Amino acid sequence: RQASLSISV
Amino acid sequence: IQRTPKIQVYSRHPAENGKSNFLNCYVSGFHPSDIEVDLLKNGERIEKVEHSDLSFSKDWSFYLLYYTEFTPTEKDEYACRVNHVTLSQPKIVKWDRDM
Amino acid sequence: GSHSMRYFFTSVSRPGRGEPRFIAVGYVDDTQFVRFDSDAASQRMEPRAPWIEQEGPEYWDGETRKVKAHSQTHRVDLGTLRGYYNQSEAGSHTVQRMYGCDVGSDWRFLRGYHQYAYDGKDYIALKEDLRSWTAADMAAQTTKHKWEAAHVAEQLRAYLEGTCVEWLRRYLENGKETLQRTDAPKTHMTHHAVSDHEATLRCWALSFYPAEITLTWQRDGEDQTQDTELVETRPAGDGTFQKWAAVVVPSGQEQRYTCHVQHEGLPKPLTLRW
């Protein structure tokens, strides 16, 4: 199951 | 950074003339991921070729497996033909049943 | 046994027309179990092993939403990095991310990782403490300060020691019949004469799982390195792996040479001789 997190550099 | 592909051409099962099998072309160690890979029978392109989903190693370099059903024989030559940005001319690696 | 779960994400920009090509894959140990390809028809996270298929509609909905969001994150990243590196908008570039967790024999947490690359070089990586960042250059330093301010390492540390590990155990249970089974290498030696006074011996290991393996040659009970060749481990195409090692020997001295095979599926190492 994927990580519940969404981030850009 | 551009890294040239390593290439292995080989059969899924030990090869026996006239007995069906799977022809594999494994490309790895390359960057960027855009790449063209064909399987050849007597220098011609085989049409029903499939491949794995793109993935990569620890050092970030890519790998892919191209494959198709085939039947080894005494007369047919099999090969994998690879082009990539790092190569100035397509590289042809011949299938050798001993490797 | 001892185990891992890993996700891999690649986006490649397409200057000229449209959105990047995006490809995501998930693995338990050496077994692919899910995939997403932005070029496919479904536009869904898809199953790739029998044991994941029993997950219900809410799993597939959730994993689809998460992977499509990931794809959009990558797309924004490709724009940001082009700026940071003062690069033209005419060329194609790549972003890669890998993350996941290992557990020991007791299925308890051993380590976690989360790392990013731009154009095939290290960009930013979470350290082993799951608290700190390794930034390779001054662009990555900017990103490190941004992720400090957004509590990113905190969230990663919680996933990696928690959800990552809990769902890995679940998969290990549901896929017991294949995932907890070791397939020992089927081994044999071939002989290829090169002349009237020399020959190649090739030691084969076939149809094994997991991929980890060691093949070594000895001469008269001592390790031999001169005149050997060792190919990279390669997929058979049916979920198993292949490898071989070869040595050139004086014809008639074949006996002195032994091939030694180490693999998790073998109680004790194998020895082969011609």
Author numbering:
A (entry chain C): 1 to 9
B (entry chain B): 1 to 99
C (entry chain A): 1 to 274
Paper text:
Phosphopeptide antigens are naturally processed and presented on human tumour cells by class I and class II MHC molecules. We defined a canonical motif, involving a phosphorylation at position 4 and a positively charged side chain at position 1 (R/K), accounting for ˜ 50% of the HLA-A2 phosphopeptide repertoire. For phosphopeptides with this canonical motif (hereafter referred to as canonical phosphopeptides), the phosphate moiety could act as a “phosphate surface anchor”, mediating extensive contacts to HLA-A2. To address this, we determined HLA-A2 complex structures of three canonical phosphopeptide antigens (RQApSlSISV, termed PKD2 and derived from Protein Kinase D2; RQApSIELPSMAV, termed RQA_V and derived from Lymphocyte Specific Protein 1 (LSP-1); RQIpSQDVKL, termed RQI and derived from adenosine monophosphate deaminase 2 (AMPD2)) in both phosphorylated and non-phosphorylated states.
